[PDB]
Design a binder for this molecule. Structure first.
Ligand SMILES: CC(C)=CCC/C(C)=C/CN1c2cc(C)c(C)cc2N(C[C@H](O)[C@H](O)[C@H](O)COP(=O)(O)O)c2[nH]c(=O)[nH]c(=O)c21
Ligand SMILES: CC(C)=CCC/C(C)=C/CN1c2cc(C)c(C)cc2N(C[C@H](O)[C@H](O)[C@H](O)COP(=O)(O)O)c2[nH]c(=O)[nH]c(=O)c21
Ligand SMILES: CC(C)=CCC/C(C)=C\CN1c2cc(C)c(C)cc2N(C[C@H](O)[C@H](O)[C@H](O)COP(=O)(O)O)c2[nH]c(=O)[nH]c(=O)c21
Ligand SMILES: Cc1cc2nc3c(=O)[nH]c(=O)nc-3n(C[C@H](O)[C@H](O)[C@H](O)COP(=O)(O)O)c2cc1C
Ligand SMILES: Cc1cc2nc3c(=O)[nH]c(=O)nc-3n(C[C@H](O)[C@H](O)[C@H](O)COP(=O)(O)O)c2cc1C
Ligand SMILES: Cc1cc2nc3c(=O)[nH]c(=O)nc-3n(C[C@H](O)[C@H](O)[C@H](O)COP(=O)(O)O)c2cc1C
Ligand SMILES: Cc1cc2nc3c(=O)[nH]c(=O)nc-3n(C[C@H](O)[C@H](O)[C@H](O)COP(=O)(O)O)c2cc1C
Ligand SMILES: Cc1cc2nc3c(=O)[nH]c(=O)nc-3n(C[C@H](O)[C@H](O)[C@H](O)COP(=O)(O)O)c2cc1C
Ligand SMILES: CC(C)=CCC/C(C)=C/COP(=O)(O)O
Ligand SMILES: CC(C)=CCC/C(C)=C/COP(=O)(O)O
Ligand SMILES: CC(C)=CCC/C(C)=C/COP(=O)(O)O
Ligand SMILES: CC(C)=CCC/C(C)=C\COP(=O)(O)O
Ligand SMILES: CC(C)=CCC/C(C)=C\COP(=O)(O)O
Ligand code: NA
Ligand code: NA
Ligand code: NA
Ligand code: NA
Lengths: 195, 193, 195, 195, 195, 196, 193, 193
């Protein structure tokens, strides 16, 4: 149930634990994850978390495999200019893509179709193939430029799922609020939530 | 610095801690608060927090005054159909209004101008007087209907400030994330801390 | 089983209560769980157009409809118009499909604007944000531009505008044949067999 | 009271009983009817009804006069390419036009101004002369293409009256539902109703 | 996997080899094909290929069955005015439709909802049923009218797949470029590309 | 002689490098001055799809392309992606026409929004503000609504959207026949003869 | 009177003298300036003026401090990828921003919200905080793409102040025409002369 | 090369030197110029320049002929209500038109089609005949009203060439900046320098 392969992209918005928690749940659900991360997102993760993420893909692939307890080849990391990567072509891309968190800059590039890196190209491919594309922005306030880009992508089928956790399950910690959004993302993708 | 009188409206979106914390900070900054709350918001607050507000405005005004340690007359509560309340007319309304949290239904009514209660009429008055109007929605995902209503109000001058706390100050508790959004609301209003 | 397991069926104050009752009956015989909602105006419509004595409060209404359709225990669930704890009010718990049959012009407007003033309008707002099937069955003549604009906007967002306009190419002999035509299209739109 | 000359066009939408019943009431109300019918509507009438309609206008005029009990010359039938017919020119056209039923193709042609036959040209003339134009579509569901065509024409003054009969007069027959829509059409035209 | 019944329409754009190759692949995948072809497309196939396609539907069905080695009844050909054909109604139409190649005229008619023939009506039905509709245009340059009609249909859920083959598999023949587009069509429909 | 004397030919990272190489060859045989631009992604596409070993640096690239097409001295001029002093970057010095072939969806987006992040996008922006012919040759399937919206906006402003969609009504026998079809349409759009 | 801290960004449009003259006037008005400059704007300044700025921010800060005679810490230069710089976040950014001159590319990125460097991110922050954002484009002719981006930013509150000096004070030198535009920028910001 | 006859209209925007310099270069390029000037532009020229322009057309034609050294009949001046003038009809109008400088009012009238004087009617004729129409506005800041009028006209084929001179040719005088804009107008029209 749900997509077997998911492209997980992390961009330079605040909330790196949303993406790390989502990656861990996708691994526990035994899904193949094509992991992409921007240069700004690597700076965010080093600023907000105690996760020492390696810079190059191969070292990053081995780190995240140990960090999540993933099986061999379950996590695949690709550089930001690796156009030969599966997510860059329609016939080879995973059946679903999540950008979590999604910076306002990546939200702008996906809305305009800039395709300046692998993350933006993979989102452009998901839209032209009409595959699930979930964007998780973190920004306050939302400008009209942010809202216009979100509305345009939402009108085209993309799911605008902001990092706005709810409080109606009486959260006790920061991780409870992170798990709220992550479960919302798995719910949108059609993947069970074994928290 | 900042508005002396603020209309604080709470509607039936999740995140009643945001509005309670914002009310407390406005009281600590010695601002006069015209407090409004919807029926659905009262149930949200009783569901998510330990605060069950008295229903009638006078008993609700005494509760919030004790809850926040406010001075006499600093917090003024008005019913949802009290059109004689200050926030309902342009000449008497407080010069700033915040809907925190702002449900998708209240976001709908403000965008269309429904004015079916005092909260929606007060937001309509704030727009026609071109006074600060801060909306704090809590919803995931945002549908195109939600985004269209936010974009229209954003284009008209309202500040769309979603309940999306940041993590770049390394929060350690739920209260740190609530304080993140409340601090952004006060900065939007021009109020210290 | 093919199609939605659980369906939110909302009846609003448009004429054509026979459409909603016949649809509820067919959904029960196809062994679907139905979360039944009804407005105050629709209760007055059913008392005016039909001889069905529908109880006013939910618990008595649930027992009446269970006996009316011959449903199993718990197959039909009735919720009040302000029951925000009902499953259809939240995305995580809502049924995976919703039908508003019949759909008044007032409910059509509220769903198009997102008013969320009752459980019916909030459930439709949830179905749109979760991108789940939302079928609207309006009954009105003529269609003003306000009606058509609200229908077009919801049609552009993925909702299915299925007006109560039965066809005659199966040579109907009774009013029930025309009622069954519209109900058959609703079940076909949802992906549910029709006998 | 009301227009004394009516252009009645039938196009290939289901519900030929609506058009035949409307023609019958217009004859009973002593109105002159300029009757037009498309090739697809002739196939619909033969499929849905037991009415054996002749193919070309002169025989069709004598049949409809006998079928409706009309006076001599009360009904005038014109071919689909008779550009010399009154409804094709502004000075000579009847000052009211009804397309009942109105197919999605005719609804599209009127909205775009195709003027490919006498029916579409007559509707184009009615719009440029600011004369009443009533369109009775029969389709379910309404696509966004259908709704935008209806919205554009309704914004221009045309009346979009879908074949959506009401049930608040407690109908007991198919003919009761047909008379509901016909009565609304006459009500829109300002013509009295008399069952 | 994928739809079992396909409506394959060929219109008067250049690239008849695309449609013939797609028909052959759909047959090899054991899919039932409802084949439609316009008069202009018949002239295109006679001009670009040496396939002698019979004009009448019954002889065309026997030819295409022998041309692709299809089973009995696997290919069903319907005339351009056969409104009784399955693709003309929502209840009976195949669950997916492809127009390959798609003329600028057919692209125009589908965008406006002209429904002047079976091909245009079947596409209009696919849109109101929200079933897959893949359009394969062949035109250069694309005018603003072409792009506006493509954008409107793409915004409604139709897949605009232009006959623009890629070269990144290093093609050696014209057939390699034809297979590139056909493979993209099958992948869009969710059908394997074993062949 | 008819048509523009100087043409800016830009190749971006869309599939179909044979289209641009064939167009450059035809413009050279028609004795046109070509200001050749190429993106880093297009250099990867050419190395992947063709057996053409294109040098990376501009001056070594200009010598290779001059010998590849048999051009005269100075007929082909190659400029780096950040060479803002290049003629195509300014309205007074830019060539009379510009062709982006092939045109990636990213370059199509940057021209539609006016990003001007490299010389190719800046040259296209200059061609639009001077109202000079701008031909875009996209290669993508399917076309998303984002692609179509960017194409419609540029087409509405005067740019020629010429997709890499070759026709079959001349009964082609090879891949190059289909490549020559698209190139001939580009030359017809520019007003240049096609005695290829 | 006027903002005490201003973000001054220079992008690769012609007219580097406008930004240098504006930076000088802001320094003489005792304002704190968060100076940002693009790679292309450095090439423009070296082409049109006698000023070739040191590339790194620290050496550029000392050069501009000596060039304008600024006090210690009055001018602060930040790199194009310094996301920790004050202008990149709403709570810490200066309350006014000027992009002078403003390239057609930066005008494009601010209109779409590209946020690809610190300059474009700072302008995006200024718009979401509803703070003064002044864009000074230099281009001729204006294409419809340029005008569409300017109209969108103008409709959102940004001030489109093109480098189009007037002649009604009868200028006698290039410096008089530069001072015309700089005077209008300061008047737009509420800063005297 | 380029149009043989050009309609040159001067309206009440600042920058009369642009129009006078453009008229001079069109004469040196042996072009026939149909010169039009608004009453507001006559006041701008008297304010910004030392050029004593006569008020009525025939004396204005003789002055401009001697000011530019034009041949006999090369410059033809027409009044603001001379509807029989060549530029007022499509069959008789010159092949190209330039409004330099272009006031915001004339920009508005051309965008709406007011045709209240010969200048506005001539621009309306140029658009309906699809002939080159160059507008040179001088205004700062550009309001959204100005930008919307410019965008509509540019979408219709008109060239919006603002009086924004560049500095990349290192100008040494006001005349160098004037010559920059004039050179771009001539290059837009297809006329050499
Ligand atoms: C003292 C501290 C820690 C201060 C932090 C101040 C800010 C800006 C906080 C919020 N925050 C943020 C935090 C941090 C640590 C960094 C490095 C960057 C951001 N940015 C800016 C983007 O990265 C920038 O726009 C890239 O250009 C995107 O590139 P890409 O799309 O990833 O390729 C951002 N963006 C967005 O949208 N929402 C956001 O909350 C933030
Ligand atoms: C086995 C059976 C009974 C099959 C019938 C299946 C269908 C499609 C039923 C509904 N139905 C219908 C019925 C019949 C009998 C025919 C011949 C045609 C239609 N069509 C198609 C149009 O005629 C077509 O689109 C012409 O091209 C319009 O031409 P024109 O405007 O009249 O000139 C239609 N259209 C529309 O809108 N609503 C509608 O309910 C129907
Ligand atoms: C413990 C459980 C199971 C709780 C259910 C949680 C649900 C259903 C959603 C979260 N949540 C929410 C929580 C609770 C407790 C209640 C009572 C209501 C809401 N609603 C619905 C609105 O109140 C409704 O739409 C009123 O009609 C608005 O009226 P008003 O504008 O205030 O006057 C809501 N709305 C919105 O936007 N974002 C939101 O997160 C929520
Ligand atoms: C007997 C009866 C028949 C009605 N018929 C219609 C109808 O056909 N269509 C419609 O839109 N409204 C109809 N209405 C009016 C609606 O009920 C009314 O607008 C109401 O406000 C709808 O509220 P709801 O959307 O909560 O049901 C009818 C009302 C009654 C009592
Ligand atoms: C040999 C031939 C090739 C054609 N090529 C194209 C083409 O590539 N694209 C296109 O849009 N039309 C092309 N046309 C024109 C269309 O056939 C024409 O517009 C026709 O009206 C389409 O009708 P249809 O949509 O019913 O097929 C071609 C026609 C012929 C005879
Ligand atoms: C071998 C290869 C083939 C590609 N095919 C296409 C294509 O057909 N269309 C497209 O838009 N992009 C294609 N891409 C992706 C683009 O190169 C990518 O979007 C890049 O960002 C474009 O940058 P540019 O516009 O500067 O060339 C391809 C890339 C590679 C390496
Ligand atoms: C000397 C020089 C002068 C330039 N003049 C202009 C100009 O007047 N207007 C403009 O929009 N771009 C001009 N450009 C081009 C821009 O620098 C180029 O588009 C660049 O990508 C802008 O990058 P930025 O927005 O990061 O500064 C000029 C470039 C150079 C090197
Ligand atoms: C000395 C002077 C300078 C002016 N400067 C400008 C200017 O720079 N831009 C502008 O749009 N209008 C300017 N105006 C105002 C216009 O002249 C005024 O709007 C007038 O109505 C324009 O009329 P016209 O379009 O018929 O010339 C100026 C006026 C005067 C007298
Ligand atoms: C004590 C009284 C009479 C109060 C008046 C109440 C209202 C809503 C006045 C309208 O105010 P406005 O004109 O819309 O701003
Ligand atoms: C011999 C005659 C009377 C021919 C008239 C036929 C038509 C359709 C004229 C156009 O009429 P209009 O000007 O568009 O209203
Ligand atoms: C020293 C040199 C060659 C400077 C030219 C640099 C540029 C790109 C000028 C822009 O020109 P434009 O006015 O925008 O058309
Ligand atoms: C041999 C390889 C790795 C080719 C990669 C192809 C790419 C990057 C895009 C084409 O894919 P699409 O046609 O746009 O879906
Ligand atoms: C007697 C004469 C020559 C009068 C001049 C004609 C005018 C002023 C406009 C007609 O011109 P147009 O038809 O609109 O292009
Ligand atoms: Na790019
Ligand atoms: Na409400
Ligand atoms: Na038709
Ligand atoms: Na840029």
């Amino acid at each position: 149930s749900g997509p077997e392969r998911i492209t997980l992209a992390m961009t330079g918005a605040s909330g790196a634990q949303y993406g790390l928690r989502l990656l861990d749940c996708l691994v526990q659900e035994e899904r193949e994850v094509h992991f992409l991360i921007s240069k700004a997102a690597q700076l965010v993760m080093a600023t907000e978390t105690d996760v020492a993420l390696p810079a190059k893909p191969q070292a990053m692939q081995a780190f995240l495999t140990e960090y999540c307890g993933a099986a061999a080849g379950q996590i695949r990391v690709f550089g930001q200019n690796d156009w030969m990567a599966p997510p860059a072509s329609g016939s080879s891309a995973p059946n679903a893509m999540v950008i979590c968190p999604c910076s306002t800059g990546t939200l702008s590039a996906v809305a305009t179709g800039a395709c300046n890196n692998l993350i933006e190209r993979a989102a452009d491919v998901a839209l032209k193939e009409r595959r699930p594309l979930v964007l998780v922005p973190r920004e306050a306030p939302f400008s009209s430029i942010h809202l216009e880009n979100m509305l345009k992508l939402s009108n085209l089928g993309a799911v605008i799922l902001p990092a706005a956790p709810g409080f109606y399950h009486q959260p006790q910690s920061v991780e409870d609020l992170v798990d709220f959004v992550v479960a919302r993302i798995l719910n949108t993708l059609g993947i069970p939530q074994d928290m």
